[PDB]
């Protein structure tokens, strides 16, 4: 197989700066017709990958000139001069000079100014009690950087089990993440306690962000 190896895997970038991904194959991509068939595709969050550069360095219609391609030997490179919010995504590089194969990928990640998280809490909805479990959600919205720790305190004594956290992707218009902390206790459980409290602790602060409710 024609093995392609992209580097790096994750690459942070400040707006306006330059950005470079390297794609190198396990072998030459020189077609007999003297044409190297190396291409770069951009697949943004939840979308269909798109063609950006074809035949080593040719731009596809509609694709800005900020995107430049080049190659030499078995080493090819894509450059995103003047980065933008919309430019976030996994950049692909594929060869079709033989049995078509693709490259691992690279997650271009916009790196912006820190931002504090806005925290909201939600008590379970009666519509869920009959399931035998009650979920309490803590939602941190519009924060940056990606990192952050959340904590659940039930009637005071912190709780660690039953916690499941998942993050969104990088918003393409403010480049800020959001995430949700889901605490799922059993029906009888969630009912033997009256004060539910999550406490977020992001970099844009030291005193944690306390937000809670009482049944």
């Amino acid at each position: 197989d024609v093995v392609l190896t992209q580097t790096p895997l994750s690459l942070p970038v400040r707006l306006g700066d330059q950005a470079s991904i390297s794609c190198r194959s396990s072998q030459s991509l020189l077609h007999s017709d003297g044409n190297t068939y190396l291409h770069w595709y951009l697949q943004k969050p939840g979308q269909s990958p798109k063609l950006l550069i074809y035949k080593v360095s040719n731009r596809f219609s509609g694709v800005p000139d900020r995107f430049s391609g080049s190659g030499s030997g078995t080493d090819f490179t894509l450059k995103i001069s003047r980065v933008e919010a919309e430019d976030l995504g996994v950049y692909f590089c594929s060869q079709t000079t033989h049995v078509p194969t693709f490259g691992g990928g690279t997650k271009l990640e916009i790196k912006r100014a820190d931002a504090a998280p806005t925290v909201s809490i939600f008590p379970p909805s009666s519509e869920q009690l009959t399931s035998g479990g009650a979920s309490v959600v803590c939602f941190l919205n519009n924060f940056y950087p990606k990192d952050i720790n959340v904590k659940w305190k039930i009637d005071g004594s912190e709780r660690q089990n039953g916690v499941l956290n998942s993050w969104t992707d990088q918003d393409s218009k403010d480049s800020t993440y959001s995430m949700s902390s889901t605490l799922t206790l059993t029906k009888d459980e969630y009912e033997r306690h009256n004060s539910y409290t999550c406490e977020a602790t992001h970099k844009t602060s030291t005193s944690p962000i306390v937000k809670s409710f009482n049944r």
């Binding site: 044409n35 068939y37 291409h39 269909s48 990958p49 798109k50 063609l51 074809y54 035949k55 040719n58 596809f60 692909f92 594929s94 079709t96 049995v99 078509p100 194969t101 693709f102 691992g104 990928g105 806005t118 925290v119 909201s120 809490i121 939600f122 008590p123 379970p124 909805s125 519509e127 869920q128 399931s131 979920s135 959600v137 939602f139 919205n141 519009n142 499941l164 998942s166 993050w167 969104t168 992707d169 959001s178 995430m179 949700s180 889901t182 409710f213």
Partner: protein
């Protein structure tokens, strides 16, 4: 403006079959080659098959790992290409993209794509709960609501608000498989005055069980 759309995915047992339909519109469907590429969360992006023009003697080419299991056909009259899939192994899982092989020797236009899950587990439609304030003081952008899609299978499920006429402020975390059940969240923020005097609804669709959903968060 060119456009392409796949279809026909869902859960399959180790061992069965399935077929996928691709409709292309915007270009002379007959003057091009068509491809099928799948994307597995392991083998990453992987090419499967390619079909060619009439004069091309409608020739096929199957990725060595799919020879005699899959079959690609086409019909210029209705402008469509098909991917017969038989003997689906867990490996065959992943999303499937229908693309066009432009003059440029590269797959230029891609479809939205379509999931395909090969497993012995059985479908289970999502369960949606209302995420509403929880009775508090206004101190967090001006009101946030949500739908807690839980215990469903397989992926994915697509949330949308007010039928898709609400895109700004939308926020959807990712799937988190646990207990064999995917679960995500989707919340949207709105001006505390445009609620609850206004109608807010999420549209949780779960393609595997073909079950769109229409719930509406209201002040409890």
């Amino acid at each position: 403006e060119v456009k392409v759309e796949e279809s026909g995915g869902g859960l399959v047992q180790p061992g069965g079959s399935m077929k996928l339909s691709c409709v292309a519109s915007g270009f002379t469907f007959s003057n091009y080659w068509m491809e099928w590429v799948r994307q597995s969360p392991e083998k990453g992006l992987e090419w499967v098959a390619e079909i060619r023009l009439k004069s091309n003697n409608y020739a096929t080419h199957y990725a060595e790992s799919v020879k005699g299991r899959f079959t690609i056909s086409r019909d210029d009259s209705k402008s469509s290409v098909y991917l017969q899939m038989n003997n689906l192994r867990a490996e065959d899982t992943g999303i499937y993209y229908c693309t066009r092989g432009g003059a440029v020797g590269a797959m230029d236009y891609w479809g939205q794509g379509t999931s395909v899950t090969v497993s012995s587990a059985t479908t289970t439609a999502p369960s949606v709960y209302p995420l509403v304030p929880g009775c508090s003081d206004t101190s967090g952008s001006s009101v946030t609501l949500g739908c807690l899609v839980k215990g469903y299978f397989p992926e994915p499920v697509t949330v949308k608000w007010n039928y898709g006429a609400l895109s700004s402020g939308v926020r959807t975390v990712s799937s988190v498989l646990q207990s064999g059940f995917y679960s995500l969240s989707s919340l949207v923020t709105v001006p505390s005055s445009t609620w609850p005097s206004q109608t807010v609804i999420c549209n949780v669709a779960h393609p595997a069980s073909k079950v769109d959903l229409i719930k509406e968060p209201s002040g409890p």
